[PDB]
Amino acid sequence: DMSEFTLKTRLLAALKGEPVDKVPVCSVTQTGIVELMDVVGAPWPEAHTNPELMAKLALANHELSGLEAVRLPYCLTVLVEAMGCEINMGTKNRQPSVTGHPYPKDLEGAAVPADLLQRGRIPVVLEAIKIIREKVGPDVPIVGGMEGPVTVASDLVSVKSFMKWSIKKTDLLEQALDIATEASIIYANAMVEAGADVIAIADPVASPDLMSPDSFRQFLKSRLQKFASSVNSVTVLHICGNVNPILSDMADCGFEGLSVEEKIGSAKKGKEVIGTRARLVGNVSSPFTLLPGPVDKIKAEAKEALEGGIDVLAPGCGIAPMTPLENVKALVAARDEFYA
Template sequence: MNPRDRLLNCLKGKKVDIVPALSVTQTATVELMRMTDSEWPEAHSDPEKMVKLAVSGHEIAGLEAVRYPFCLTVLAEAMGCEVNMGAMDIQPSIVSNPYSNNSDIPQIPDDLEKRGRIPVMLEVAELIRDKLDENVPIIAGLVGPATLTAHLMGTSNFLIGLIKKPEYVRQFLEVSTDICIRHANNLLEHGADVVCVPDGTAGPDLIDPAMFENFIKPEYQRFCRDVKGFKVSHMCGDINAILEPLSECGFEGISVEEKIIDLQTAKEILGDKSKLIGNVSTSGTMLMRSYDDVKNEAKNCLEEGVDVLAPGCGIAPNTPLKNIKALVDARNEYYQR
């Protein structure tokens, strides 16, 4: 199988020859930026630089997919948040929340696709598809509805609102989900094969699992129903408490980080509803330890039964290139035993 067929068949629940080795989260590193002359922060906005940097994760680092963009601020910026674009080794961050001091519900602008960097995201999907052969999958990232809501109203307002203004937050989440659905479908229509939805604000580290069931799960179900393509959820932290309801939302894949220690149990919980993706530690192993350490942890993930071998979170910008290559090397060695 080629990498694209392998990933898409895996997400469909079909048998594949070997486990895909790739990243559903951000892949840019300082080393790759220098090798491609495509550095942050320019590569967050410049289509050509974004394409070169994203594709380098496949062509240079060897990952079996191209994943872009490199931050979680695109939709928030388009909806009015101010963004600090960061530096060569620092990702963009939200610095203002336009709905922090009122109780308004945002309206989706008719010209959403023309706002902020959204036009760049759509153009880049087409450029990557033109640059690559059809055998390489493209994974496009977009922030999830809980995190988008927190960006727009402020995280503390979101968390307090879940308790004190539940109907207001529910209405806000519905609009955020509508925005995510619209953007995800646009990305897929412009060439992406899979959309990945990081939404750490929805996890047990911040909200009670009962609130996830009540507020987030219905929006995820609607997102998965209305997005016409493959969908992967990514959530940081220990999400054992919500793995079962998350598996019932309709995501073809669920990406977990290293805090999910018992991968076999996680895989049993997901059953045939969703594929398990992960979960080599990005900060503890890929960034800080050796090539052999990365390979050993990757092989353990394979032994535990992951369906897609991947970093447990976004790759840190200062991660050594050899430690990214270790993922595919470990997978290949695992199947040569």
């Protein structure tokens, strides 16, 4: 059976810690790059709103790069926009970002709407998953990406209020977190229904760079656990920054895989504190290695990750849009060279 893996079965097995023939190489974070936008005719920002173009751009960084999955969409704003956040849609090389927060003072009116799945670009993402499945077939995995519940709550109330309430109005923090989690689960299961094989949430606001490890444990962990156990899929939890102080807690959250940056140090250092509770995904620096290169540095840092027991070889965060195609190929070549 070790000789019969598909790209899909290898990723799922790897994330679950089952035996595999080799470590898979892919990205669970955003994969839109300028060089590919130009090659296949699917540039931002149009690729965020047109499902066919969203599909094409995502496909390109599988077919033309060798990454062993397809990942969509390209931003952390689809769900929060659907929940009332105002968004700036960015540019050809700048991601959409949140500019307006609907609930900076109180949660009056914040309930999750019955028509959530019809709002904003949620229908675009769901359709793009179906289109991508058509284009790659059943044996290549589709990773559905989204902002996580902590980041959703914070986007809804503004990060200033979120941080303030964490100390001074913890009941409101919790209410915001519960609404955010409920909406996140509904969206994540919708993506599973549409064809996603893995749901990979990115929750930067849960990072120790922004929230204390103690507040992670006290308030955030239980919602991340509720998310993982309510979503009917293998899941991955991505949190950037130096997450070492919460890495064990991340490993308790019910996600099969933990996606981390280079800021944890070597993959081995991470493996040594999570044991068999969760698998590790990463961790080659997106801005400081994949973006500038050189190819040889990408490969060396990738090989260190593999030697340290990384379960899925991946960029540490979103691929920087100006990343050359050749640098993405380098990540794949490193895995291939590793197995001789």
